[PDB]
Structure 1
Amino acid sequence: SMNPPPPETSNPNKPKRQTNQLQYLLRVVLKTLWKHQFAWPFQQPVDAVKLNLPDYYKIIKTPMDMGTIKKRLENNYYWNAQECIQDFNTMFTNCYIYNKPGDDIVLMAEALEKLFLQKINELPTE
């Protein structure tokens, strides 16, 4: 089996900004989720070869992971916070699409998503 190339984390012709909302997404949101006991399945792209999930990238056509999001934030890849929030939501949604309800990995995603929602509830204005 083969994995696909990972999502891009740098693109010199993509316009970039560093806003206070994006700084919050790195310093508060990403850092809170990254240190969590349940973060580890989400800290890198799914290696469907090593995990013996040959159908993963047949089902998941918009992969996303926190390793990618971390690199994007540290590279100032984004223009606005909504782009980054969409990446997080894609990662959670992919987990719920691929896995069975009640699987341990789904419980892990739900726990991270609850914290995610609590932090973005206080996303600073501007």
Structure 2
Amino acid sequence: MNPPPPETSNPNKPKRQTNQLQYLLRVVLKTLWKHQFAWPFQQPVDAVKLNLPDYYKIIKTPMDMGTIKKRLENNYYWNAQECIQDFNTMFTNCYIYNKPGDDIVLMAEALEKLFLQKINELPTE
């Protein structure tokens, strides 16, 4: 069964627009989004549709690039590191729920390498 997806708006949360967060949306997120391995990560895992009744019994901090994109577009984040943590959470969830050599893990590994390549250098403030 599906829990509520992670929030993408929160009026009491303090927000900030930074050059680095703009970069995370304009180039980092949008480049990863077009990768041929991006499709499993563009939306919250639907455990009912995907027939994974144990997904959310295992994964307790779900995250996906669709949620990250909406957070960025809604200026949800305070700084780039908060956004980077969401990316890292998404990748780690994939490695936790699956196992080495799974097709989904191969995809996450390729995306994670591209992700780190893109954030290795960020713009300044």
> Is TM more than 0.5 here?
yes
How many equivalent pairs are there? 125
User: Any stretches of 5+ residues in structure 2 without a counterpart?
Assistant: none
**Deviations 1:81-123 (CA, angstroms, capped at 9, x unpaired):** 0100000000000000001110000010011101100000011
> Equivalent pairs: percent with the same residue?
100
Runs of 4 or more consecutive aligned structure 1 residues displaced over 4 Å after TM superposition: none
Cα RMSD for the two superposed structures: 0.6
CA shift for structure 1 position 124: 1.7
User: Any stretches of 5+ residues in structure 1 without a counterpart?
Assistant: none
**C-alpha separation between the residues in 2 aligned to 1:97 and 1:119?**
24
**Deviations 1:41-97 (CA, angstroms, capped at 9, x unpaired):** 000000011111111001100000000000000000000001000000000000000
Which residue in the other structure is 1:33 paired with? 32
CA shift for structure 1 position 125: 2.5
1:5 matches 2:4: yes
What TM-score do you get using the length of structure 2 for normalisation? 0.98
**C-alpha separation between the residues in 1 aligned to 2:99 and 2:16?**
38
What TM-score do you get using the length of structure 1 for normalisation? 0.97
Matches within 5 A, 1:1-126: 2-126=1-125
